[model samples]
Target: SAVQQKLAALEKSSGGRLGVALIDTADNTQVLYRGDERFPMCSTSKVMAAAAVLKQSETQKQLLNQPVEIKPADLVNYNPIAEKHVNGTMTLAELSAAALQYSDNTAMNKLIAQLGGPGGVTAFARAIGDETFRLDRTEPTLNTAIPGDPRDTTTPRAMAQTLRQLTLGHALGETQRAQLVTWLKGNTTGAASIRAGLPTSWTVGDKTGSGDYGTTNDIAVIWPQGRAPLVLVTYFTQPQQNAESRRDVLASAARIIAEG
Candidate 1:
């Protein structure tokens, strides 16, 4: 099959562990390569955490626009967004936007804490039918790789499934879903990965994740002209590869999927 051939070539070109799950939203057809393997999600876990917070707001009657404080203790060196504004106050909605759009580690820590902790995010993932995804640590500490403990992890297939649910407005209502999509589409982190390979007219709403051990990933919905959107989930665990090479792999995968 075309999908298999392209994926096999991607595997060879990656020169490391690569997992992908491509889905055609129009027909629900899917193609997978090492999609079941668990890999660290890095900042990609923010999407789930955001969803959990939004759902909680609905259940608890809390307002998304309610202001929250960002103390000095919450500031982390790894986050560009929070590093710019060390301590201040922003609404929960604004905080979610910062976390998703900029992949801000500090903002993510605050969001996860608002959800009660990493366990709260995990519960949300479980509720959404994800079996392999787990949120075990807050940011900064969670960003590093442990020898044997994988705190924040997800499978390519599981990510694709979660995207599918979001697309269909399953757990979140239409308004909340729209808000989430808007946040994802506004992501400004990695433009060279999946977004680079896409056509000029095509639009992508995505989340990118990266870490120390060659963990580069992008989960997205691509809208090609005159067609239903497609879901592309790519995860690479190439301990020996550089960030540029991992990003190139994602771009190549996107091009191949677009060609198909």
Candidate 2:
């Protein structure tokens, strides 16, 4: 089929820097376009972080509307657009949006700090039952500059698998899960992958992570498409040339799976 051919061509053309996995949610076992390679999770870590927050909220019977103040100092490593108003305060919900939509590093780090640091978020990832989604420890890291040691990590299979759990409501209750989906729909980041390829009407809840040292990653859920919600996790690194060309490769891969 054209999908298979396109996937093969993409892999061949990229020479393995790009890795992808598209799952058939219905059967669990599905197509894997270089699914095993490890790639930096980028800001996609926010997905896990967000899930952890939601899960913890549910456990503690907390409300999502809790307001948070973004002090001037908190703007470091954050999106300039979101950080424009240094003293502006927003609720947890808004923080989540900023984190996903703008890929606000400051907002994400704040949430991580609120959640008890990276290990706390990683604990949530493990609680959701995914062992492959790994985070860096022993050294503090932020999404802003190139890492001196570079330790963040994830696998396509693990990311797609985590999305599957979210869709199935295995990670949180229906309400929380639904809210997570809602947040995903609002995601303004990572537009180059599945969203670029799929029909506009098709709703996609996704998160993208990009960093220095040649790391770019995206994770998303394609709704109501018979085979499964179609989870796509793609990674590209090394020889960063034309970002548009790299994105086009991602879009092409997604278009193929969508057509299938």
Candidate 3:
């Protein structure tokens, strides 16, 4: 009854295909609404790629501080941060921060390349037991697609599970996990999503994804003071749906989860 009520309310308020997975980390209780259905990941795949890179860094004893060059050709049209800079060098850690914090497409592409490309990212997903998640193509190409292909996609439950692994230190080492969290917390995108829905005392570390044809999504680690953190994953899509409204739906879902 509670699930039905919540689903009905969400459906009424959100005129789009929606998916949600909310997990209470304390007791591992979960709420899944269309959680098994797939949705385009967009820039949220950057998080997955980042995880893969970190895992590689650990295994190979590679330093995140190693410098990498970002040439003029590396810049993409949709990336704000990458567009503003001239050809130069940034450490792998700095590039990762740009990829996660600003959702810079160029940085993400470079990170994916460093991780051995889309296949590497998919391998990381599989290693984490996310059978449905895939990273088949690079950015800019995926970002430009209208009604994006499901080739680069993830389900809410899969994303929630991935985040859970990151939180529990199952997928990455302690330092890598902390670094990943730091990048996520520094995320400047998705201001209108989960973070905006929270009370002042609560904080959220999240990554956002957006695409043409009204694709909007967010995956977050919500921290409520004096309480264990919760993981919330949400996706919204519709042909020609408004991005702002989709964000509103995500925000509403966050509020609902917080209250419960």
Worst 10 residues of 1 by lDDT: 237-246
Q: Report lDDT (CA) for all predictions.
A: 0.82, 0.71, 0.81
Best lDDT goes to which candidate?
1
For residues 135-193, what per-residue lDDT tens digits would candidate 3 score against the true structure? 88898766432454677878898899889898654689988998888888888987899
Query: Candidate 3: which stretches are off by over 4 Å?
Result: 144-148, 241-245
Model 2 C-alpha lDDT per residue in residues 1-260, reported as the tens digit of each score: 56667888877787546778878766776777667766767777888777777777786675467878778766655465447656777777777777777788777876787688788877877887888776663122543224333356777888888887875556788888888888888887667766898887777888877665556667888776444466777766644333332566677777877777
lDDT of 2 at 70: 78
Clashes per candidate (backbone, < 3 Å): 0, 2, 0
Q: Flag regions of model 2 displaced more than 4 Å.
A: 1-5, 80-85, 137-150, 224-228, 240-245
For every candidate structure, what is the RMSD over all alpha carbons to the true structure, in angstroms?
Answer: 1.9, 3.2, 2.0
lDDT (tens digit, per residue) of candidate 1 on 126-196: 89788788999887767664423567888899999898787554688777888888888899976988998
Least accurate 10 contiguous residues by lDDT in model 3: 140-149
Clashing pairs in 1: none
Question: Model 1: C-alpha RMSD to truth?
Answer: 1.9
> After superposition, which runs of candidate 1 have C-alpha atoms over 4 Å from their true positions?
60-62, 146-149, 241-245
Candidate 3 displacement at residue 24 in angstroms: 0.8
